[PDB]
Amino acid sequence: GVEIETISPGDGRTFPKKGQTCVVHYTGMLQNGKKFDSSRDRNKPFKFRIGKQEVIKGFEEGAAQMSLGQRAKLTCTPDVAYGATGHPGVIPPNATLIFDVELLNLE
Amino acid sequence: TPDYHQHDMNFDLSKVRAVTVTMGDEQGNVHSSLKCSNCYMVWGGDFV
Amino acid sequence: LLLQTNLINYVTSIRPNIFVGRAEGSTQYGKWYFEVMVDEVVPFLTAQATHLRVGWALTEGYSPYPGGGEGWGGNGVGDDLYSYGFDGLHLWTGHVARPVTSPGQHLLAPEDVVSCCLDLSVPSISFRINGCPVQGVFEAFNLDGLFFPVVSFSAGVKVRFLLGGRHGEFKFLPPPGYAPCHEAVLPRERLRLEPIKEYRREGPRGPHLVGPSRCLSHTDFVPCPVDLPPHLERIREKLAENIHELWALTRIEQGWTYGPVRDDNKRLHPCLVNFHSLPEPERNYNLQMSGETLKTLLALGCHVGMADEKAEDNLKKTKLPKTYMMSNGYKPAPLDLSHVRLTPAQTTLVDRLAENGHNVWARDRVAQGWSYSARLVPYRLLDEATKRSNRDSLCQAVRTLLGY
């Protein structure tokens, strides 16, 4: 249950596949308008590898549907990311998630 | 609602901000008609 | 419960000098149109995104207030009920946003054009992307003042702002019936870009603290025309002929000696004869608007009474500037209404009467569908040149004081 809405056009041809590195210099907010995570503030491009499930499934399946250079708006259902307990101390139980995600390079 | 800052001594219910937002399709047929107001009151003089 | 905190960037708004509003009186057409040019490529410079919005706001904004705000910081246009704007993907009214649909579905990007709309009978605001309509309109406003073309920008922005006939090269054709917005300017100065509600400005010494400025209103932009002794109605032609002396004075300098065919361009005039020799609508032409003026003159509050009676004929005319004589035999010669230096009130009473004349004619022009299109504004707001001719023309009629 993920929804994707393009914000700026990207390459539209090259898409990430298994066994490939992805760097995501993103920012993240909550459904009510508060943001609880970012990568631009730390000024370090977050990098992760698809296929080994080191990231929440909602995020990876959302990123699988976008191309290089695209900035988009992502919306995860609470059932796909930290369903019942959540991450203690940062996010309340049973909350909707909002992500501002863009991809720098490497497909 | 908190975004309301009308401080006047000549206030009547006509002097209430109210903005109607409507949206439709490309065909022009509407699709919703929302009205935001900064005030939701009645007049006590409308009963006695 | 607690007091959260974070970092917020800064934004500022800029508007032109134009001022459009709708009210009973001179209200133009309620149909205006403009575009704009954007060529900025900085989406994430200094962390947060670069805010960019355009739209309308009424003349009670007070939004700028650089620093704190309501939601997060002293934001720009669209986050209130006194401003309506667009960003590229959302409509902002009351600090809450809703998505829009259009072909392309991308927010403001370099090398793009957005077209706004204004129509104050439906009254509603629409927007148009470079070549396609934006599916969304606002309505049911509460129009009471005027409106600003407003822009919003965070930093690192070099937007070019399009107006029209002055220099703005309209890329696209406005829909049927829309003034290019260059016509509407205060007819007392030039147009320029200034920041709204500024309270600090630079200078040779440095900062300058400026207080609140002044502004017009709906009532101000509306012309309003003002609301028997035998001698009052006895003079009539005597004052009219005295006024009619000047009707050729500078029309001698124009060289218009009683043109029998009304030469509007080749320097001749058809009403340059005596009253009875004049055509039918030429006696009340100089008396009806004067007799009513004298009739209204009591409402002017002036202290006037016809009691001079200095030999009843001592008002001698001034004539004999060479030939100066026509086929009619008029040889215009203004009388001795020259040595009358008026009164402190009369210096303004003549102006007050002149204001009534401009206002009365404004109502007459407004009656025929605002002069039926094809250029006169309310008194005390109009240009400087028009303020010059109307004084001298009415003065000669008013100089008859202490003469009769």
Added chain:
Amino acid sequence: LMPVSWSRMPNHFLQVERLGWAVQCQDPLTMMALHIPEENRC
């Protein structure tokens, strides 16, 4: 309601004719803020 407050004056502002009558803005600027959530000013 009282129509008065006391707001501070930032020490640095945003600083800033030809074809198009363009605007001028180069430098960025930012500030720290609070978000007391009961009524939501900032």
